[PDB]
Design a binder for this molecule. Structure first.
Ligand SMILES: N=C(N)NCCCNC(=O)[C@@H]1CCCCN1C(=O)[C@@H](CC1CCCCC1)NCC(=O)O
Ligand SMILES: *[C@@H]1O[C@H](CO)[C@@H](O[C@@H]2O[C@H](CO)[C@@H](O)[C@H](O)[C@H]2NC(C)=O)[C@H](O)[C@H]1NC(C)=O
Ligand code: NA
Ligand code: NA
Lengths: 249, 27, 10
């Protein structure tokens, strides 16, 4: 996260860290949507251009974390993956269209003050909150700058941007399964997700029922926190049908 | 269920330092 | 630079 701030304790209890077993390292961010399901970006698990193609056994998910590198004894919980599910129409060849994936845990994780699931939006929630100007929150343990690593989870609030503006900021083809967020140059304020933040959640707190909803997933960007550029996120609601089908199994 | 309600915040009626910024943007 | 995690997690 570039130009963000240290998260408060228990501020993002659904935050999940995808951890690589062998070379123990940070693989991506993710989110907890139930005691047995974790949501993340498809490119965190599958991305042929970089020869990335993880299997259930290549990684672990660490839930309830704050510190990036420390093993948080008595607080974080480490889970193994039973199965990975990548959206069948995930477009890694061109623009990361439908950049979403699900991971089923071998055993349900126990909720606590630091481990709690985030809500997934319904049609009305999406319709009412996904508006240009409305701010969401992005969290992650990724790079603090484009070109280092944070000590603890970082957080930044960013406004959703009008589709025309998102489109005119890049050469990449944008789809309805994406939305972009970030401040414009004339708005002064800054902030963006960066390398390592992939798969993390873009959340919004409903002013109607005061619950947190995950509206997006950190998907892609060109550089980090560059003027005239924006971060792009997977449109969670647009792909909820797939999510429900997988969970319903 | 109780999704989206944080044990250390919503559940205790405590607000985090920047959530108000989000609310204020929902004009 | 990550702290080693319990071996029980493989
Ligand atoms: N919010 C911002 N700015 N960045 C955080 C997003 C993290 N995702 C990636 O880096 C993904 C991961 C998969 C490969 C590369 N990639 C990128 O975003 C690419 C842009 C395009 C790659 C091909 C598909 C369309 C998007 N940029 C890398 C970079 O700018 O450093
Ligand atoms: C990515 O890895 C998966 C396995 O994790 C590969 O899937 C294989 O698909 C073939 C289909 O012919 C099956 O017979 C194999 O059992 C699957 N697993 C393995 C380990 O081969 C997949 O081919 C790899 N590449 C891509 C682009 O997905
Ligand atoms: Na364009
Ligand atoms: Na920018």
């Amino acid at each position: 996260i570039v130009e963000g701030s240290d998260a408060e304790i228990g501020m993002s209890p659904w935050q999940v860290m995808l951890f690589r077993k062998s070379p123990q390292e940070l693989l991506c961010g993710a989110s907890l949507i139930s005691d047995r399901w974790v949501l993340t970006a498809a490119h965190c698990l599958l991305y042929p251009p970089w020869d990335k193609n993880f299997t259930e056994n290549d990684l672990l998910v660490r839930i309830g974390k704050h510190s990036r590198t420390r093993y948080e004894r008595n607080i974080e919980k480490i889970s193994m993956l039973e199965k990975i599910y990548i959206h069948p129409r995930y477009n890694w060849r061109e623009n990361l269209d439908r950049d979403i994936a699900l991971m089923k845990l071998k055993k349900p994780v126990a909720f606590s003050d630091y481990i709690h699931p985030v809500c997934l939006p319904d049609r009305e929630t999406a319709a009412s909150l996904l508006q240009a100007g409305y701010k969401g929150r992005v969290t992650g343990w990724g790079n603090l700058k484009e070109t280092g690593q944070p000590s603890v989870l970082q957080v930044v609030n960013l406004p959703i941007v009008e589709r025309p503006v998102c489109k005119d900021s890049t050469r990449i083809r944008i789809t309805d399964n994406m939305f972009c967020a970030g401040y414009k140059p004339d708005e002064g304020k800054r902030g963006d997700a960066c390398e390592g933040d992939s798969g993390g959640p873009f959340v919004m707190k409903s002013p109607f029922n005061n619950r947190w909803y995950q509206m997006g997933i950190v998907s892609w960007g060109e550089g980090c926190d560059r003027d005239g550029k924006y971060g792009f996120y997977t449109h969670v609601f647009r792909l909820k049908k797939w999510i429900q089908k997988v969970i319903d199994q | 269920a109780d999704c989206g309600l944080r044990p250390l915040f919503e559940k205790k009626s405590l607000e985090d330092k920047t959530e108000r910024e989000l609310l204020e943007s929902y004009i | 630079d990550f702290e080693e995690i319990p071996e029980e997690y493989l």
